[PDB]
Design a protein around this nucleic acid. Structure first.
Lengths: 58, 75
RNA sequence: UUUUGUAUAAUGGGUCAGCGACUUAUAUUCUGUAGCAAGGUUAACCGAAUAGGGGAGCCGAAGGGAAACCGAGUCUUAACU
RNA sequence: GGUUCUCCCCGAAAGCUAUUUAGGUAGCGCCUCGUGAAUUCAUCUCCGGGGGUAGAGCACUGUUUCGGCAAGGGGGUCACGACUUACCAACCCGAUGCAAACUGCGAAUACCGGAGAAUGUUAUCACGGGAGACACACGGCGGGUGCUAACGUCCGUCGUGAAGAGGGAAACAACCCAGACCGCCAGCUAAGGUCCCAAAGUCAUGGUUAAGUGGGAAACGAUGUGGGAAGGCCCAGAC
RNA sequence: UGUAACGGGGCUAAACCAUGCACCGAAGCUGCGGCAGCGACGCUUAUGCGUUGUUGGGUAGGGGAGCGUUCUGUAAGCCUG
RNA sequence: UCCUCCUAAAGAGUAACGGAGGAGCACGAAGGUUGGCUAAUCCUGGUCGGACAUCAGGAGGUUAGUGCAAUGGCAUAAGCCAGCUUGACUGCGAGCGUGACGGCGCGAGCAGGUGCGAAAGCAGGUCAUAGUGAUCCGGUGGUUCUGAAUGGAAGGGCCAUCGCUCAACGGAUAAAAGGUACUCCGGGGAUAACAGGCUGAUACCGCCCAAGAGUUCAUAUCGACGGCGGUGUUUGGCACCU
RNA sequence: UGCCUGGCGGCCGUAGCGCGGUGGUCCCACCUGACCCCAUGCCGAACUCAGAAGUGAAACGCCGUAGCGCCGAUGGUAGUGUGGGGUCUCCCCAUGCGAGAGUAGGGAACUGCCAGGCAA
């Protein structure tokens, strides 16, 4: 719907395959990398899955 | 004096509710009849349930004993 | 070097120089490249000869069946929805 | 056992099945290169699914404690009638438990199918050429085995090592942070740290500790000390 | 064998609990310079890119591209008392 | 080798010299169809007869039964009885499950010809899951398919079928046991024996509770029934180092 | 349109059991006979045929009753995915999902088609 911005704050080395897929599906590649997406229940679910390693602001 | 076992027979549900199947495809492999054949579903000699028509498979509970049935609707 | 794992107190080497290990022949399959193309190519041999002759032969364009046999069909079957 | 020049790209496995087979080998799984293909595939949301695991429960299969009613059984009064009991006790009823090989119940996850947006160098599948590997190890979680012993052994799933340097845990493959294309006497951070060795707070506020606790260890013992909720007796005067 | 159960000095806060603001801290991230692979697009079309995004730890192993040595032709040419 | 349950962590699969049990069949009917029927265990009455034979009624609703161990299933019964029968049939087979493969399993439907029923319909063995062995070689019956000059035949091929506890059950031969301290070679700390290491069951030592003994009195001295620790001094486990 | 009745279903225990009441105008059941159709591993029991006298006893349908079965919250608890922590053979924190049993309560059904009688 609206503008939403996400940043990666933790490494993705010792993480489960589902988490790595979620980061890959979100576009994040490296720590500190900022990605630009749109608000959406599907997108919100992805953030909640890996909320421990990403920071989201609107 | 133990140590003997039998090769696993790989039973169980092969096709789950809400997915289309072709005629003659195996839906459930079972020893007894945990699921009973419904509409457009046939029962084999070994109690295998297979599709007699093409369509979507669904599960339901019917009868006075609340026994589970598998049906197919042409969709 | 060998191992899940070696500074390991596991193996090998005192040092220097020299030598020292995936080759060769004939077949078969795949890839690249070159020639020709429903055609492609000769072997032995002949040859004042790396030329030119030599098409014996091999591979390919048609397959199916155990086979006879049939043939863009064939086999299966008394016969195929 | 050994196998000799350089650079660039990708990058494993120590599994399954079979084997006079177990330290070999073959097919498959995993790797690589080429060719051809469908929003093929992955993550998330929603929808359609079947479970019998955790937990729970005791209807069932077993096991277990207590109380009652108590058929029935023994001794005793009787004259084929019949009766009592200080004594044994079935089946049931009420309450309490236990179970990998119990289920009248039943998750979270995982798995299969469908629709949808974004994202990803087609990450997917099929065919062809070439492989290696089939001794795994530790850590977390769920277990069998052992002594809920072993850096023990045997499975499931994820991570790391193997095949990954760097920082941290004094030193310490497998633990925590984090994936090194090269150069810079540039900056900001992660785990972990900031009195000195040794980079950074002898920083601020409110408490605790007297033991060098911190900086190994239990049952159990004790007017150590701090806080909280109460309770009995108390200037008709308590200890 | 020697303190030897904070790494040591040493510490009564330089210990522990709660809150907060600072700083240090890696080859992580950012800044600057350089190299190479891969996919796109604006355009060069056997190659640079005014570009764009991303990738570049690595054993067994697979793929690609190169250096150097001896000898043959080019070469009775060229260098050399 | 094969079958059932658990381990197995709610799809499938999943190891151990982990915990429990079974199979190497049977049946021309115990198969097909049509028609009909519905247990175990208790209570009461009744000759032998008795707790437990058979009869009648009642509660019960499957604790019964299902040829064979276990699991799942079974009232439309797959359980029990009777009539008629041979579909325990031939040629196929869309489409699926399961395996590395060899292979194994399920199957609507089509053609031919049958059985049961008035008929719709059911029948390609058995409630299902074990009852099994590749290839080679050779035997028996059918079939001009072939049959090396010709016509035959022999021998092959095709179809049906027969001969292995080849049980070490993917079966190395049709055919095979021991000793070596007289020993040898290639390897391994992938694997034992001495020592180290990890662990601490066991052992040794210490402590907690306290029944009791000790002239009475648990704790002068011992201290059963039980419990919690330390040491790495025994006997052990593991196989990390050589 | 309503009280009823029979058949075929949907739905399947809030629908099933126990106790009491209620029904014969039709329908239903019981009931008479069975030489013939048909059957008893003996029996008109059951099945079948010819009938309708009698009856609502039994069975069946309806009503009432909670005495049982059954259904069942809210809250809490157990467990659990992901990420952290601990005096780590077991637990705790943040977030997501969230039972089973029990409790309050509900509860002695609802509904479609056809056919027949009475009143309309």
């Amino acid at each position: 719907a609206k503008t939403i911005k996400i940043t990666q704050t933790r490494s993705a080395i010792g993480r489960l395959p589902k988490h790595k897929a979620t980061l890959l599906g979100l576009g994040l590649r490296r720590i500190g990398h900022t990605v630009e997406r749109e608000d959406t229940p599907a997108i919100r679910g992805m953030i909640n899955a890996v909320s421990f390693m990403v920071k989201v602001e609107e | 004096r133990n140590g003997r076992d039998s090769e696993a027979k790989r039973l169980g549900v092969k096709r789950f509710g809400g997915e289309s199947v072709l005629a003659g495809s195996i839906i459930v492999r079972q020893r007894g009849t945990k699921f009973h054949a419904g509409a457009n579903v046939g029962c084999g000699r070994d109690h295998t349930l297979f599709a007699k028509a093409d369509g979507k498979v669904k599960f339901e509970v019917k009868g006075p004993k609340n026994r589970k049935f598998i049906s197919i609707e042409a969709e």
